Structure 1
């Protein structure tokens, strides 16, 4: 956590570079397994060799540690940090829509700056044009203050459109968090659960609403179960316009909300724990159900859930508020 840090930290620098700038899926994969195990390791790595004894710990990497352990840095680490090209790839990646594959393609073309992206707005597909559009707004954080008014609106429509609709803004926001990165509404409805052959509209209906009224400005993507957009709070009585925010809405079977909702709330850690705990208490939990364990090694059979509670009671825990889903 702090004894192995620079080491794991430098490791991940390396990894993330292999995978992004280069297409070394493997090396990249290498640095990370290492970056992992050395992290577990309870003692201060004193040298290459000491490390080397570790699993996934090669000589290539061990070599890396010496230099790092010896001089406060790393040449390649220094060498990569500089490189406009790799530098350039690191940045374009930031534009919503741009992954590395594209990132690289763009570069080779000689698109390295934000402006390049501009002059060549033509080479970008919708997602990316939008990304490019709201570059400042997507990188900006979401105040709970705003989070509150936001949430406020999305509920009223939902409600207004149909009243049988259940919404839930999961995420950090849901867990207290003074700020969030993007709003995430969970969506269900009774007429939609597991077997019932869809009702895409269910999704569509709302998106229409939210748009109708001007909350959803743009669309990144809309499927019959996952809509991926952009929102905006009605700039009051002028002077103050609101930032463009990422909003994502997804349809769920009534019969799988709670686990799902459980899930999306986190924290990434609480889930595990909770998830690790269920294991003992005779269960399994995942993004959708909770199936009682059978000694033969494994087992199925989705137990029924009507609230966050059910999942809880099931595995025999204390209902932990979202506020407290911290870990």
Structure 2
């Protein structure tokens, strides 16, 4: 019990997985105090998770999400109008509150046949840091950024992810990350009944063989619904 309750509290800190949590409790750190007195035992991601432990357990009001959206979309547009940025998650479905901000980013210069273009993403991250919206980085790779942001003022720090997706796979991504999970499940099931398979990257025909063919052209979410003969489903109507 004691061990379990300690392992559960730790897992509430972003970055601290189950294994990492056990190893930590196994070393004598169980409380928030212990953690805060032992940052030297945590990697960068876990340490930032600890720093904003409380803030990260707070919900985000839609009104704030909207202000966050404006900041993101506006800065991106200034860097290059060709950039396309979409805030997904339950927020895109009209949710009155969110737990984090998930942003899908693309640029016509970056397609799936293209090699890595990390600066496409990092340029955006750097600018948002410049305007002081992004305050910390949990981690960042060639196509994904996980960090912390804050509205200027008192405002809680919020979790934000920015994913760079190839232009030719962008809308399948926006669809997937908009959800909900139930809706995605139901849409993929229907796609199958129609001879198509859909994932977060593409929609492909499904030969009677069961083996998916080449990816089909997608230039909007609408195209995906069109392929499977479903009338367009507004994000607000995608609870399931």
Q: TM-score, normalised by structure 1?
A: 0.72
Q: Distance in 1 between matches of 2:48 and 2:99?
A: 17
The structural deviation recorded for 1:170 is: 0.6
Separation (CA, whole Å) in 1 of partners of 2:198 and 2:69: 28
In structure 1, how many angstroms separate the alpha carbons of the residues matched to 2:198 and 2:170?
13
Higher helix share: 1
Residues 49-95 of structure 1, C-alpha deviation per residue, up to 9 Å, x if partnerless? xxxxxxxxxxxxxxxxxxxxxxxxxxxxxxxxxx2111111111111
Q: Displacement, 1:198?
A: 2.7
Picking from 3, 13, 24, the partner of 1:95 is: 13
Matched, 1:228 2:146: yes
Q: CA deviation at 1:224?
A: 1.2
| CA deviation after TM superposition for structure 1 residue 296, in Å | 2.0
Distance in 1 of aligned mates of 2:176 and 2:41: 38
| Per-residue CA distance 1:144-175 (angstroms, 9 max, x = gap) | 01000000100010001111100000100001
Give the greater-gyration-radius structure (CA).
Answer: 1
Classify the secondary structure of the residue corresponding to 1:246. strand
Aligned residue number for residue 184 of structure 2: 271
Q: Distance in 1 between matches of 2:139 and 2:192?
A: 37
The Cα shift of 1:122 comes to 1.6
Return the offset for 1:197.
2.1
Give the deviation of 1:108 after TM superposition: 1.5
Q: Structure 1: state its 5+ residue gaps.
A: 1-82, 236-240
RMSD: 0.8
The alignment covers a number of residue pairs equal to 240
Per-residue deviation at 1:315? 0.3
1:322 aligns with 2:240: no
Deviation readout 1:245-275 (Å, 9 max, x if unpaired): 0000011100001111111111101111110
Post-superposition Cα deviations, 1:216-236, rounded to whole Å, max 9, x if no partner, equal: 00000111110110000001x
CA contact (8 A) 2:197 2:212 kept: no
Structure showing the higher strand proportion among its residues: 2
**TM-score normalised by structure 2 residue count:** 0.98
- 1:306 is matched with which residue? 219
Distance in 2, matches of 1:313 and 1:119, equals 56
Question: Which of structures 1 and 2 has the larger relative contact order (alpha carbons within 8 angstroms, sep 6+)?
Answer: 2
* Secondary structure of residue in 1 paired with 2:168: helix
